[PDB]
Amino acid sequence: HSPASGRYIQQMLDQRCQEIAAELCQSGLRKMCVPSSRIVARNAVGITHQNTLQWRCFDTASLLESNQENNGVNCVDDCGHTIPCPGGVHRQNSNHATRHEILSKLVEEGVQRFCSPYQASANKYCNDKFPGTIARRSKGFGNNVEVAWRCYEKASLLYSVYAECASNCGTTWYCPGGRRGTSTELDKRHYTEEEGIRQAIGSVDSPCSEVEVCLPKDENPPLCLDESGQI
Ligand SMILES: CC(=O)N[C@H]1[C@H]([C@H](O)[C@H](O)CO)O[C@@](O[C@H]2[C@@H](O)[C@@H](CO)O[C@@H](O)[C@@H]2F)(C(=O)O)C[C@@H]1O
Ligand SMILES: [Cl-]
């Protein structure tokens, strides 16, 4: 068991999308008659004139290997933030079903189960200061070694790259959505906030008593074990 996000919200969205595709197939929608391996949930633009980010059930066979670059697809972390995932929408040829309401509801429900209150606090600090940003302890511009707590514009993160985030005990954890420390323009889109983010994390009340040891888990609540006596 790794100290890492299980990406449980994304898993649930993919499974729900697999069920929806199967239901559309039964309704006669031929292009939705596929094995489950072909269907994922992504938050993205759609076909032409579908220009808002919405939760949609995509056939992966219709996705483009690259985006360029307003047509990227986004996956979701376990605190419900959308982050760039591999691939792009084909604006003419996409095979998808927009299901924004049900998929958004599943995200909201999942956040309660899976989002570390310590991470939620760090994310809130960042969004309050820099709207749209989330917290990670990760790389900056043109330095692929140094990590620091920063408020990152979500578009600058990579879902396939894990980066440090706060566990539900306020201890080291790793979450999808990280930086490579490359030197692209996107690599600039962050605001380093060591003091403010650490304070946000430090301000969270423990799920355990002062007489218990917090052992973090990939779901809330963490384990609170009775502290060992002067045995
Ligand atoms: C340009 C951008 O979107 N973000 C840059 C930010 C940003 O301008 C400031 O954080 C706004 O207050 O600055 C970065 O560089 C920082 C950083 O090196 C810190 C270390 O604490 O020291 C400051 O003097 C630098 F401006 C940042 O926050 O990382 C670079 C971002 O691209
Ligand atoms: Cl996560």
Side-chain angles (χ1 to χ4, degrees), residues 4-7 76-80 83 114 119 136 159 162 165 173-176:
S5 175
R7 310 189 307 277
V76 67
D77 71 18
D78 278 352
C79 284
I83 290 158
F114 302 112
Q119 186 58 40
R136 295 286 190 268
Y159 194 78
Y162 265 61
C165 52
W173 208 249
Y174 303 89
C175 288

Side-chain angles (χ1 to χ4, degrees), residues 32-64 67 71-104 106-194 196-198 200-209 211-223:
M32 284 294 156
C33 299
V34 293
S36 286
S37 58
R38 292 264 302 269
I39 296 290
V40 293
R42 300 283 184 264
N43 183 272
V45 309
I47 61 164
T48 305
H49 303 325
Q50 298 188 301
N51 301 324
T52 72
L53 295 175
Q54 298 278 278
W55 278 113
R56 315 186 203 258
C57 300
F58 286 89
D59 175 0
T60 59
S62 76
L63 291 181
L64 302 171
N67 67 303
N71 68 325
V73 299
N74 304 286
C75 294
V76 67
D77 71 18
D78 278 352
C79 284
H81 307 286
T82 50
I83 290 158
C85 249
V89 182
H90 195 309
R91 305 302 306 276
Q92 296 77 44
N93 296 162
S94 187
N95 179 17
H96 66 256
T98 302
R99 287 297 185 278
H100 193 64
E101 289 158 292
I102 185 60
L103 296 171
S104 296
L106 288 181
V107 174
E108 299 172 48
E109 292 170 358
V111 169
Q112 300 303 318
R113 288 183 64 183
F114 302 112
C115 180
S116 158
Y118 293 83
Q119 186 58 40
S121 188
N123 284 341
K124 170 173 209 301
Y125 167 85
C126 283
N127 185 68
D128 287 356
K129 201 167 181 185
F130 303 105
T133 62
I134 66 175
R136 295 286 190 268
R137 177 161 187 260
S138 192
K139 317 286 172 63
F141 172 84
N143 181 328
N144 68 10
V145 173
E146 187 175 336
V147 297
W149 280 109
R150 322 183 206 260
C151 302
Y152 287 100
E153 295 192 7
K154 298 189 304 297
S156 78
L157 301 168
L158 299 168
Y159 194 78
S160 64
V161 181
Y162 265 61
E164 182 177 342
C165 52
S167 75
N168 60 8
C169 295
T171 69
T172 308
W173 208 249
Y174 303 89
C175 288
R179 289 290 202 77
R180 299 198 213 268
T182 39
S183 309
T184 73
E185 187 68 18
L186 270 183
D187 289 296
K188 293 172 181 191
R189 308 305 306 178
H190 60 266
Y191 310 91
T192 303
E193 297 288 346
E194 294 261 55
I197 286 162
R198 281 180 157 92
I201 290 162
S203 79
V204 177
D205 291 331
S206 181
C208 308
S209 84
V211 106
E212 300 174 320
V213 186
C214 194
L215 291 103
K217 288 167 70 173
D218 60 4
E219 181 172 9
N220 301 318
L223 179 59

